[PDB]
Amino acid sequence: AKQSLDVSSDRRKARKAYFTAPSSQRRVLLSAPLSKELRAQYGIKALPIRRDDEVLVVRGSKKGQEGKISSVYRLKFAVQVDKVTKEKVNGASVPINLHPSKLVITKLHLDKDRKALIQRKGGKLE
């Protein structure tokens, strides 16, 4: 359990931390676990998701679907993946706001910041 005094376990404080979080903390919160293959690739379980990479959906009503992230809607703690949309009765399209805890990353978009992050997290990066 909670051993440090400087850690707190109040529900009210925790929700006030969660909903009032700044966006730089949110991309740390908006994290998705990698695949078994990507864990076999880099030796690492979960990562902060961004928009350029590719993912699959492992829960929800749209389970067993996949795609590249269109945009990360950090303000709603959510992430619009391309091609997973509800088509309205006008015919227009609106994506389902997914949540990265229910997602599994399939193909990473690797960058120098990303490669250095994998290196600092102990990754066996090729």
Partner 1 sequence: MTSVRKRKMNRSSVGKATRRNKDKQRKINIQSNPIIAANWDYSLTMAQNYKKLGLRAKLQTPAGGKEADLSKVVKRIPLTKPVTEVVKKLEELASRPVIRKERSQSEREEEWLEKLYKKHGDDYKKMFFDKKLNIYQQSEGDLKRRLLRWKKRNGI
Partner 2 sequence: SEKAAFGNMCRGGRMFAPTKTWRKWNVKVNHNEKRYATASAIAATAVASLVLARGHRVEKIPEIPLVVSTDLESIQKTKEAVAALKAVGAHSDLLKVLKSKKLRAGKGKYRNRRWTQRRGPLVVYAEDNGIVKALRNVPGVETANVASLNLLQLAPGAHLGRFVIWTEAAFTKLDQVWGSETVASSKVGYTLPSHIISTSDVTRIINSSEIQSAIRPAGQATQKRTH
**6-25 binders of partner 1 (CB under 8 A):** 6
Name which position in 1, 4, 91, 112 contacts partner 1 (CB under 8 A): 4
Which residues from 13-42 bind RNA, rule CB under 7 A?
A: 13-16, 18-20, 22-29, 31-33, 36
Query: Which amino acid makes up residue 123?
Result: G
Quickly list H helices, 1-126: 11-19, 23-29, 36-42, 112-120
Residue 125 Cβ vs RNA, minimum distance, rounded to whole Å: 11
Residue the block writes with tokens 């966006």 = 23
Residues 4-63 within binding reach of partner 2 (CB under 8 A): 9-12
Q: In this chain, which of 51, 82, 106, 125 binds RNA, going by CB under 7 A?
A: 51
Q: d(Cα 21, Cα 11) in Å, to the nearest integer?
A: 15
Q: Of 65-104, which residues contact partner 2 (CB under 8 A)?
A: none
Q: Which residues neighbour 23 within 8 Å (Cβ) at sequence distance 6 or greater?
A: 74, 75
Q: How far is the CB of 113 from RNA (least distance, A)?
A: 3
Which residues neighbour 106 within 8 Å (Cβ) at sequence distance 6 or greater? Answer: 35, 38, 54, 55, 56, 66
Binding site for partner 1 (CB under 8 A): 4-6
